[PDB]
Swiss-Prot record:
<feature type="repeat" description="2">
    <location>
        <begin position="104"/>
        <end position="181"/>
    </location>
</feature>
<keyword id="KW-0238">DNA-binding</keyword>
<dbReference type="InterPro" id="IPR033710">
    <property type="entry name" value="TBP_eukaryotic"/>
</dbReference>
<keyword id="KW-0539">Nucleus</keyword>
<dbReference type="InterPro" id="IPR000814">
    <property type="entry name" value="TBP"/>
</dbReference>
<dbReference type="InterPro" id="IPR012295">
    <property type="entry name" value="TBP_dom_sf"/>
</dbReference>
<keyword id="KW-0804">Transcription</keyword>
<keyword id="KW-0677">Repeat</keyword>
<keyword id="KW-0007">Acetylation</keyword>
<protein>
    <recommendedName>
        <fullName>TATA-box-binding protein 1</fullName>
    </recommendedName>
</protein>
<keyword id="KW-0805">Transcription regulation</keyword>
<comment type="subunit">
    <text>Belongs to the TFIID complex together with the TBP-associated factors (TAFs). Binds DNA as monomer. Interacts with TAF1 (via N-terminus). Interacts with MEE12/CCG1. Associates with PWP2 in the nucleus. Component of a nuclear protein complex containing at least TATA binding proteins (TBPs, e.g. TBP1 and TBP2) and ATX1.</text>
</comment>
<comment type="function">
    <text>General transcription factor that functions at the core of the DNA-binding multiprotein factor TFIID. Binding of TFIID to the TATA box is the initial transcriptional step of the pre-initiation complex (PIC), playing a role in the activation of eukaryotic genes transcribed by RNA polymerase II.</text>
</comment>
<feature type="repeat" description="1">
    <location>
        <begin position="14"/>
        <end position="90"/>
    </location>
</feature>
<dbReference type="GO" id="GO:0005634">
    <property type="term" value="C:nucleus"/>
</dbReference>
<dbReference type="InterPro" id="IPR030491">
    <property type="entry name" value="TBP_CS"/>
</dbReference>
<dbReference type="GO" id="GO:0006352">
    <property type="term" value="P:DNA-templated transcription initiation"/>
</dbReference>
Length: 187
DNA sequence: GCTATAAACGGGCA
DNA sequence: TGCCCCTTTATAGC
């Protein structure tokens, strides 16, 4: 439990990685769809072949421009590992795929701070950043500015941390908010 | 299922 | 440029 990087003693667990990659060749989406079993394609709803693999369980959206977005992994390494497996698939189906400019694009994390949270008290004294309409959505949307991270804060004490590009942004965001959430420990 | 968040992609409207 | 979609993921109330 590394105290320096996380004085709270709680580390958020990563829940979803969104990465993209440039295969750098033009693809026949219809041919890929016919020859692949794990690939769906309806171009009149969405211009991407949706491919899914089980290990690591991820979903790829592959486009005729040769751009691919990989989604569903729970680590950046698993995102790159999955993105490679997709690129080898299209290679074996007869396309000169490359692996150019792989970039994590969005990381989703979550954790628990163990204590219930008085949401109405935080939505008031942090009205500049908070948006809390419980009849619409039971969590309050907290828009942190440095780092530019959105937090979903719930009464139970569970929080969602989104919008980060690097996991250190997720870790830094959680602990800019933890001493805040401590002031609103519900009785 | 709906409601809420972020991101990339291609694509509709303006 | 803006608006709206598009997939995924945690969270949670109806």
């Amino acid at each position: 439990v590394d105290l320096s990087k996380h004085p709270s003693g709680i580390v958020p667990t990563l829940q979803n990685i969104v990465s993209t990659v440039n295969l750098d060749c033009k693809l026949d989406l219809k041919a890929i769809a016919l020859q692949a079993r794990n690939a769906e394609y309806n171009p009149k709803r969405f211009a991407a072949v949706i491919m899914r693999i089980r290990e690591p369980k991820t979903t790829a959206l592959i486009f005729a421009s040769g751009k691919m977005v990989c989604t569903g992994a729970k680590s950046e390494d698993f995102s790159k590992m999955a993105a490679r497996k997709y690129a080898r698939i299209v290679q074996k189906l007869g396309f000169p795929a490359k692996f150019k400019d792989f970039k994590i694009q969005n990381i989703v994390g979550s954790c628990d701070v163990k204590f219930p949270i008085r949401l109405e008290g935080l939505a008031y004294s942090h009205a500049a950043f908070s948006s809390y309409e419980p009849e619409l959505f039971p969590g309050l949307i907290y828009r942190m500015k440095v780092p530019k991270i959105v937090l979903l804060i719930f009464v139970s004490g569970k929080i969602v941390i989104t919008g980060a590009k690097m996991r250190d942004e997720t870790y830094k965001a959680f602990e800019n908010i933890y001493p805040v959430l401590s002031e609103f420990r519900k009785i």
